[PDB]
Design a protein around this ligand. Structure first.
Ligand code: CLA
Ligand code: CLA
Ligand code: CLA
Ligand code: CLA
Ligand code: CLA
Ligand code: CLA
Ligand code: CLA
Ligand SMILES: CCCCCCCCCCCCCCCC(=O)OC[C@H](CO[C@@H]1O[C@H](CS(=O)(=O)O)[C@@H](O)[C@H](O)[C@H]1O)OC(=O)CCCCCCCCCCCCCCC
Ligand SMILES: CCCCCCCCCCCCCCCC(=O)OC[C@H](COP(=O)(O)OC[C@@H](O)CO)OC(=O)CCCCCCCCCCCCCCC
Ligand SMILES: CC1=C(C#C/C(C)=C/C=C/C(C)=C/C=C/C=C(C)/C=C/C=C(C)/C=C/C2=C(C)CCCC2(C)C)C(C)(C)C[C@H](O)C1
Ligand SMILES: CC1=C(C#C/C(C)=C/C=C/C(C)=C/C=C/C=C(C)/C=C/C=C(C)/C=C/C2=C(C)CCCC2(C)C)C(C)(C)C[C@H](O)C1
Lengths: 172, 32, 187
């Protein structure tokens, strides 16, 4: 129970990960719950990888990448890498994967049986047993939201100051 | 240098036209 | 991860409706549902035709760079397309392959009627898998795997020539990155 003054939408009735009844605008009234949860997990995972990658980029780079990309990071890095073809390759291959993601969403919405965000990617059988799986679901969702907000914060920090994450937090 | 029907341009155009002309019934039947 | 029945190849997609598993090479990989819109027999015949053409195409793309005949001339295959278009032999290749596909179309139309197996032209002059039935499906699986691999390989070789401007044998011995990237700045 998130906001005591208001009430959750009837789609928010438990039986979902992270359901604290927080939806005041009423997105679940007009949007299907499976699409919403799939999009939430997709945004969360994308932002998790983006935030970790931005931290790694502002800490340590690959060998030989500074010779071509120069001292450009975040948005200048994107502007140079679209001309380099790195982001073109990323777009092609990730859209190719999102084709299968799209048909997974379609089969979920028409009732194949899969849950939102479930792509079956579990190497090493990590967290596939007992209540650990549900705890990992909650951890993944909360950390995805946190990484989403942190990704927005890092992007806007580079917008304002023009500095990377690890150097902005040390040169206030 | 060849022109008209003897040109290979019209040859590959003809094979594409036959491809579409046979694409109608075979894929209509595969649909049915 | 969650319980439920899914495809053997893709674990987050269900088994397609028309991919029962009787046909060889079927790992349940049809995400967009092409088998739901069109017949599986016509699709299998198209797949086999594309794959066999791609097998011969990969073999040619290797050999023509490896060894060119005493006639014609020493030239890379991709511009050799234009050379033989201007020479007139490729129009004859087109005519003879069209003559073969005239009977191929009747075979395809009898495949829709269910009188012949898809892609089965009954062409086994060496009887490599004609008398034995257990070898037949193994050779069919090998043929379809080689077909898919050959389609991928010919596309790869062509698109490597399109940006590298080197032969396939030339590229595996004189491997250079594209666009001068070894010493490129602000790319
Ligand atoms: C260009 C190719 C391509 C295509 C066709 C898709 C297709 C899709 N993406 Mg997508 N995506 C791609 C590349 C692509 N992705 C790349 C490169 C990224 C990373 C930048 C993403 C990041 C992304 C997110 C974060 C989300 C999608 C979502 C979606 C779905 C809904 C799209 C819609 O209706 O609008 C659909 C399966 C959404 C989804 O699955 O909603 C349920 C969603 O939330 N995609
Ligand atoms: C998901 C978001 C995301 C995006 C958009 C990018 C995009 C980019 N990264 Mg990056 N990266 C990511 C995640 C991401 N990465 C993650 C999760 C890590 C940690 C493993 C890294 C670690 C990393 C390093 C160490 C470097 C880059 C670099 C780059 C740039 C050159 C392309 C390249 O070689 O990528 C490489 C990306 C990977 C190998 C990560 C793929 C593996 C995970 C699992 C996905 C490009 C703009 C280079 C750069 O900044 O150029 C100046 C560079 O040196 N990335
Ligand atoms: C995926 C990560 C990754 C890894 C492991 C490498 C690894 C390497 N790169 Mg490299 N590179 C990468 C991504 C990566 N690159 C990206 C994304 C770009 C695009 C900007 C480059 C652009 C690049 C150049 C321009 C050069 C290297 C070079 C090198 C080599 C340096 C030799 C050395 O110090 O030891 C090394 C093998 C150098 C080399 O000798 O390679 C030919 C070199 O001059 N890299
Ligand atoms: C730490 C964050 C985190 C956590 C707790 C989870 C948790 C989960 N994910 Mg998941 N995921 C994440 C990040 C995370 N994910 C990211 C960033 C991506 C994008 C690549 C994905 C992509 C993904 C897919 C495609 C799938 C899952 C699935 C799952 C579930 C089963 C697998 C499992 O237990 O993995 C446990 C995972 C961890 C304990 C994470 C370890 C963190 C490492 C050590 C970080 C590496 C260091 C780095 C440099 C910092 C589980 C709920 C599967 C699912 O939905 O089944 C229910 C599934 O199919 N995830
Ligand atoms: C029996 C049927 C038949 C006949 C009569 C012809 C007749 C002809 N073809 Mg031909 N062709 C046929 C079937 C046939 N083709 C088939 C089934 C194919 C495969 C699709 C081709 C593929 C083909 C190509 C690719 C070319 C011809 C060419 C020619 C012409 C050159 C003849 C010449 O002077 O060579 C003299 C003949 C000899 C010296 C005898 C030996 C010929 C070589 C050494 C044997 C072949 C070796 C190997 C299989 C290649 C001639 C009009 C050429 C052309 O257009 O001419 C300009 C040409 O470039 N044909
Ligand atoms: C290595 C690839 C390969 C494999 C495994 C097969 C396998 C098969 N083909 Mg097939 N085929 C291929 C390539 C291949 N083909 C190519 C490239 C063509 C175009 C010319 C054809 C054209 C073709 C037709 C028209 C027909 C078959 C048929 C068959 C089936 C029965 C015939 C048989 O026993 O062949 C066994 C084949 C082999 C053991 C492979 C021999 C590979 C040689 C040695 C390579 C030549 C050397 C070269 C220079 C490199 C069998 C499943 C028949 C069918 O559908 O019946 C079910 C049929 O009617 N094939
Ligand atoms: C049999 C499958 C196969 C294999 C082994 C390769 C292997 C290779 N390809 Mg390739 N490719 C393939 C299929 C394949 N491709 C397909 C299906 C296409 C069509 C989209 C391409 C299009 C393609 C391009 C456009 C390029 C490569 C390049 C390369 C080389 C660089 C590797 C790399 O950066 O990653 C490498 C030898 C690059 C190259 O030429 O290396 C210098 C390059 O620029 N490939
Ligand atoms: C528009 C998306 C939508 O909402 O409609 C739902 C369907 C997709 O469901 C279909 O459903 C198929 C599973 S089944 O039909 O329910 O068995 C599945 O293969 C896939 O999701 C899709 O093809 O619409 C499509 O996107 C058609 C698929 C596109 C490719 C067609 C293959 C043949 C091309 C001609
Ligand atoms: C050059 C290579 C051959 C050298 C010639 C050696 C023998 C001469 C034989 C005539 C060539 C072979 C042959 O019979 O060609 C003659 C051929 C006959 O074509 P028609 O006049 O039937 O074609 C008109 C078209 O519109 C189709 O109706 O004419 C051509 O169109 C090509 C003309 C040569 C291009 C002129 C420009
Ligand atoms: C799923 C699965 C697996 C897996 C996996 C993987 C790959 C899991 C990956 C998980 C990841 C990458 C989590 C990232 C979280 C990032 C966060 C919370 C944000 C950080 C940014 C911050 C805090 C910014 C801070 C900031 C800074 C710096 C300065 C400015 C201020 C501010 C913006 C606040 C395996 C491989 C284990 C196998 C398993 O079988 C299946
Ligand atoms: C455009 C552009 C680019 C770009 C870009 C990019 C990536 C732009 C990205 C912009 C993003 C991600 C903005 C998001 C900011 C997050 C917000 C506003 C929410 C925070 C959460 C809040 C306030 C929570 C509030 C709360 C709620 C609701 C619940 C609890 C209460 C409370 C905590 C108060 C590039 C890099 C491609 C370059 C290109 O050349 C130009």
């Amino acid at each position: 129970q998130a906001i005591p003054g208001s009430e959750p939408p009837p789609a928010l009735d438990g039986t979902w990960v992270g359901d604290v009844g927080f939806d005041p605008l009423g997105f679940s009234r007009v949007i299907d719950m499976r699409w919403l949860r799939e999009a939430e997990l997709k945004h969360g995972r994308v932002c998790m990888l983006a935030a970790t990658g931005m931290i790694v980029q502002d800490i340590a780079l690959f060998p030989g990448v500074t010779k071509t990309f120069g001292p450009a990071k975040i948005t200048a890095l994107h502007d140079v890498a679209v001309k380099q073809g790195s982001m073109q390759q990323l777009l092609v291959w990730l859209g190719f994967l999102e084709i299968f993601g799209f048909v997974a969403i379609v089969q979920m919405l028409q009732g194949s049986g899969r849950q939102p965000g479930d792509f079956g990617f579990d190497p090493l059988n990590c967290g596939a047993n007992t209540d650990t799986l549900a705890r990992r679901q909650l951890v993944e969702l909360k950390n995805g939201r946190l990484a989403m907000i942190a990704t927005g914060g890092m992007i806007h920090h580079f917008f304002l100051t023009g500095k990377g994450p690890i150097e902005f937090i040390t040169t206030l | 240098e060849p022109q008209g029907l003897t040109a290979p341009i019209v040859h590959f155009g003809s094979v594409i036209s036959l491809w579409l002309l046979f694409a109608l019934p075979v894929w209509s039947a595969a649909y049915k | 991860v969650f319980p439920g029945q899914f495809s053997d190849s893709v674990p987050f997609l269900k088994q397609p409706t028309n991919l029962d598993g009787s046909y060889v090479g079927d790992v349940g990989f049809d995400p967009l549902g092409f088998s739901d819109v069109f017949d599986i027999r016509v699709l299998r015949e198209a797949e086999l035709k594309h794959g066999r053409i791609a097998m011969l195409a990969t073999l040619g793309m290797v050999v023509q760079e490896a060894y060119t005949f005493p006639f014609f001339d020493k030239v890379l295959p991709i511009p050799a397309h234009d050379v033989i278009v201007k020479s007139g032999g490729m129009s004859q290749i087109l005519l003879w392959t069209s003559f073969a596909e005239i009977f191929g179309g009747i075979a395809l139309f009898q495949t829709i009627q269910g009188k012949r197996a898809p892609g089965d032209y009954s062409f086994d002059p060496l009887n490599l898998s004609a008398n034995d039935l257990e070898k037949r499906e193994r050779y069919a699986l090998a043929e379809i795997k080689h077909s898919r691999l050959a389609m991928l390989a010919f596309s790869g070789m062509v698109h490597q020539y399109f940006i590298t401007n080197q032969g396939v044998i030339e590229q595996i011995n004189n491997f250079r990155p594209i666009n001068g990237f070894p010493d490129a700045t602000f790319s």
